[PDB]
């Protein structure tokens, strides 16, 4: 719905530590795993990184 509470402006997204942050350093939660904003990351066979809050995997 259109709920009521404490938000912060749309340029800012909520971080775990009570602050909210722009999406630049907004970590990724791939598999739940809290990747830092720049994490290059891959098996032999997959290839994955965290860009901006989204986790870009490939194969």
């Amino acid at each position: 719905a259109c709920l009521e509470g404490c938000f912060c402006p749309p340029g800012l997204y909520m971080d775990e530590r009570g602050d909210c942050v722009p999406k630049a350093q907004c970590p990724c939660y791939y598999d739940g795993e809290i990747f830092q904003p720049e994490d290059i990351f891959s098996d032999h066979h997959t290839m994955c990184y965290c860009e901006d809050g989204f986790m870009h995997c490939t194969m």
């Binding site: 891959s42 066979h45 290839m47 490939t58």
Partner: protein
């Protein structure tokens, strides 16, 4: 960091100009690089590295489809993340 003049020939690398365009020859190490006035890198490389090298200019094999084998070694369809 020390700006040197030109031509320049230290360590077996002759840094010369050819046809008004700058050249770097590494014939001992089996390559020739150059640049034009507009700025267009070119690398002539010896067949000694045939299916040896791997970088941004792809492998020196015959095939022209497989030459995105990443720093790990992964055939990636994308010409960008590679």
């Amino acid at each position: 960091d020390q700006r040197v003049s030109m031509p320049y020939a230290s360590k077996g690398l002759y840094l010369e100009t050819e046809a008004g365009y700058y050249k770097l020859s590494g014939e001992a190490y089996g390559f020739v690089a150059r640049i034009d006035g507009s700025g267009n890198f070119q690398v002539l490389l010896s067949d000694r590295y045939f299916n040896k090298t791997c970088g941004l200019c792809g492998n020196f094999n015959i095939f022209a489809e497989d030459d995105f084998m990443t720093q790990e070694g992964t055939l990636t369809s994308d010409p960008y993340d590679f």
